[PDB]
UniProtKB/Swiss-Prot annotation, chains A, B:
Post-translational modification: Processing at the N-terminus can regulate receptor and target cell selectivity. Deletion of the N-terminal residue converts it from an activator of basophil to an eosinophil chemoattractant.
Originating species: Homo sapiens
Effect after changing R24F: 95% reduction in activity; strong reduction of receptor binding
Glycosylation sites: N14
Record key words, sorted: Chemotaxis, Cytokine, Disulfide bond, Glycoprotein, Inflammatory response, Pyrrolidone carboxylic acid, Secreted, Signal
GO cellular component: extracellular region; extracellular space
Tissue expression remark: Expressed in the seminal plasma, endometrial fluid and follicular fluid (at protein level). Expressed in monocytes.
Function statement: Acts as a ligand for C-C chemokine receptor CCR2. Signals through binding and activation of CCR2 and induces a strong chemotactic response and mobilization of intracellular calcium ions. Exhibits a chemotactic activity for monocytes and basophils but not neutrophils or eosinophils. May be involved in the recruitment of monocytes into the arterial wall during the disease process of atherosclerosis.
Family: Belongs to the intercrine beta (chemokine CC) family.
Record carries keyword Disulfide bond: yes
Gene: CCL2
GO molecular function term, any single one: chemokine activity
Residues of the full protein shown: 24 to 99 of 99
Protein name: C-C motif chemokine 2
SS bond partners: C11-C36, C12-C52
Length: 76, 76
């Protein structure tokens, strides 16, 4: 018993495999819908160029982390 | 010479083929990216349930029209 199967499933096709400077990365909305053939990272650059990036990369593990901590500034 | 090929291409897979009441349709953002395997209509219902609908249907031709004229009210 599905429910809302006619949904625009936001998915990707390629992945910015170039070390994109964390500066260009204005934000990151990791894609991962159950209907997408492949997961990805929506590195919303500064120009709003949502770039799907392979989360299994070694440069997205660092960048995606600063975005993972670029919202609220923790304290010590 | 491409440019931004690692983009999250918002596409669909199925299409609400049931005559969805124009009331449920809160808005419509017709999908049609050059990377999507199929065009569609993002009938943003009231619950924000973006429903990709076949623009080649006979009920989406009427609904999609009221959405096509549900923004500004023309005058005579």
């Amino acid at each position: 018993q599905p429910d809302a199967i006619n949904a625009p499933v936001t998915c990707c096709y390629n992945f910015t495999n170039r070390k994109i400077s964390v500066q260009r990365l204005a934000s990151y909305r990791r894609i991962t819908s159950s209907k997408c053939p492949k997961e990805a990272v929506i590195f919303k650059t500064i120009v709003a160029k949502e770039i799907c990036a392979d989360p299994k990369q070694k440069w997205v593990q660092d960048s995606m982390d600063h975005l993972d901590k670029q919202t609220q500034t923790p304290k010590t």
